[PDB]
Every structure is written in structure tokens, then in C-alpha cells.
Amino acid sequence: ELDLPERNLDRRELRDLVNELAAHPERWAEHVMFPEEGGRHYASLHRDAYVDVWLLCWRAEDDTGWHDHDISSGAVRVVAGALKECNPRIGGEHLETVVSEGESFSFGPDHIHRLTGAVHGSVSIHAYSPPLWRLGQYSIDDSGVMRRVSVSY
């Protein structure tokens, strides 16, 4: 568990949190894992009524798929390696940005994105407030029509 405030954090406070956590490897180093399993490894660092914090360790294959975080704001800090964040554009030519170690970003509740194209062994820290208990996963039937499946987390 982390020792965080007993309230919701806005996106700039989430960004401060993921960046200060990056500078405190004591909070997360023991949770760094890359399975011979295949499959993306998650590690929860903190979950309470206000904030969720995760440590993600990325393989080159990992893809979040398109999704929003319902009512959760969030922030991401890349600790090692690099990620690609994709934002959806009506038309099909999505904007893609590479986020490298040391760099971070934040988003509000209306955000839709996809995190993918990771360097193998990449590590990142993700923080959400309110907690990420629901997320919407966007899919496309081969008829082209998009849907949003709201999933627990």
C-alpha cells in the first residue's frame, strides 16, 4: 500500500504521483516481473476508494486495445524503455506518440487511447482517480461498426 491522501486526485496530481513513484524504486522494484509466461504482467501498488496505482511490465507484444477509463482520470510515467500511445481519429489515421523513459503524461475522464508498441522489458507506472473499477473496451465488427464493452477491473 501507498500513503496517499484520502480524496480524489486530479490529473496533475496523478502526474506528480507517478513521477515521484518513479524516483522511489523501493515502492515498486520488487514487483517488476516479466514472465516466461508470455502475457502482460500487472502489479497493483495501491487500491483504495480514491486512487489505483499499477506497475506495468511490457513485452514487445503487449497491446491494451482501444479503451476509455469511464470516469477515471489518469497519468502514466515510463520508468524504463518506451511506449506508444495512440489516440483515435474518425477516419482511421490515428495519432501515435512515443513516450520514452523519464517521460510522463496525464488525461481526464473523456480520454480514449491505446498503449502498444513497447520495447521488450519496458516498465511504466499508471495511476487512476477515481479508481479504475470500470473501463470501456472498443471493438469493431468486420461490418466496420464500433461497439463499447464496459468491463470491470
Q: Is 26 annotated in some ligand binding site?
A: no
Taking CB under 5 A as the criterion, which residues in 79-138 touch Cl ion?
A: 126
| Residue indicated by cell numbers 480524496 | 7
Q: Is 48 in the site for Mg ion (CB under 5 A)?
A: yes
Taking the complex as a whole, the smallest distance from the CB of residue 88 to its own copies amounts, in Å, to 5
For residues 66 and 130, give the distance between their C-alpha atoms in angstroms, rounded to a whole number.
20
The SS3 call for residue 34 is coil
* Cβ-based burial of 55 (10 A; exposed 0-12, middle 13-18, buried ≥19): buried
Taking the complex as a whole, the smallest distance from the CB of residue 39 to Cl ion amounts, in Å, to 17
Taking the complex as a whole, the smallest distance from the CB of residue 76 to its own copies amounts, in Å, to 17
Q: Which is nearer to Cl ion, 27 or 74 (CB)?
A: 74
Q: Is 71 in the site for its own copies (CB under 8 A)?
A: yes
Q: Determine contact, residues 113/66, Cβ cutoff 8 Å.
A: yes
| Total residues binding its own copies (CB under 8 A) | 26
Q: Is 100 annotated in some ligand binding site?
A: yes
Q: Is 24 annotated in some ligand binding site?
A: no
Q: Spell out a b/e string for 106-141, using b for 16 or more CB atoms within 10 Å of the CB, else e.
A: bbeeebebbbbbbbeebbbbbbbbbbbeebeeeeee
Q: Which three cell numbers stand for residue 132?
A: 479504475
Rg (C-alpha) for the chain, rounded Å, is 15
Q: Which stretch binds its own copies (CB under 8 A): 52-60, 75-83, 116-124, 132-140?
A: 132-140
Residues at the contact surface with Cl ion, assessed by CB under 5 A: 126
Residues at the contact surface with its own copies, assessed by CB under 8 A: 68, 70-71, 87-92, 95, 109-112, 134, 136, 139-140, 143-150
